[PDB]
Amino acid sequence: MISLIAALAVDRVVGMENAMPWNLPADLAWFKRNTLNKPVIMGRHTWESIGRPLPGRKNIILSSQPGTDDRVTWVKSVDEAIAACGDVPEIMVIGGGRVYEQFLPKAQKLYLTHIDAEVEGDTHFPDYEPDDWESVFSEFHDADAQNSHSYCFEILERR
């Protein structure tokens, strides 16, 4: 199946011009846990943000131009991205906004982190129609000495 993973501020905000104004190591650990040993599909702006290949995962970058880094795989369409993943139990779509919108209609699972933060952003997670999604796991954590904001992990499945 296809899954999306994202961290959402209030108002579904996922990105802005610069890095997001939060320090959330427990969320990063969650991201790493849920993506290791799976292929990850991302857009070019997300690739540039991350700044390097994510280790232990097949990295697939969407761009309409030829690749500029021979360490990862570069594709020019949603279908080509999916084919490049091969025969796996779970493909992870890791953003950003333009990519999440394209893959949400194909997805069977969402891994969301809801962060209690107000951030004016320019990039949003797509609207996910309630009738089409069921929540299967939730876990709340408060802000603390190592995490700047409170964070609630959720996993939803399509219905």
Ligand X SMILES: NC(=O)c1ccc[n+]([C@@H]2O[C@H](COP(=O)([O-])OP(=O)(O)OC[C@H]3O[C@@H](n4cnc5c(N)ncnc54)[C@H](OP(=O)(O)O)[C@@H]3O)[C@@H](O)[C@H]2O)c1
Binding test (CB under 6 A) with ligand X, winner from 63, 108, 147, 148:
63
> Which entry of ligand FOL, ligand X, none binds 54, CB below 5 to 8 A by partner kind?
ligand FOL
Sites for ligand FOL among residues 94-153 (CB under 6 A): 94-95, 113
Q: Note whether 32 binds ligand FOL by CB under 6 A.
A: yes
Binding test (CB under 6 A) with ligand FOL, winner from 2, 3, 5, 125:
5
Q: Map residue 115 onto helix, strand or coil.
A: strand
Give the separation between CA 1 and CA 17, rounded to whole angstroms.
31
The tokens describing 137, both together, are 């796991």
The answer to whether 157 and 109 are in contact (CB under 8 A) is: yes
Nearest to 89 by CA among 18, 21, 38: 38
The span of 37-45, 52-60, 66-74, 143-151 binding ligand X (CB under 6 A) equals 37-45
> Which entry of ligand X, ligand FOL, none binds 28, CB below 5 to 8 A by partner kind?
ligand FOL
Binding test (CB under 6 A) with ligand X, winner from 68, 76, 83, 140:
76
Q: Note whether 28 binds ligand FOL by CB under 6 A.
A: yes
Give the separation between CA 159 and CA 153, rounded to whole angstroms.
20
- Helices and strands (H, E) in the chain, number of each type: 4, 10
The tokens describing 75, both together, are 């594709």
Contact positions toward ligand X, by CB under 6 A? 6-7, 14-15, 20, 43-46, 49, 62-65, 76-78, 94-99, 102, 123
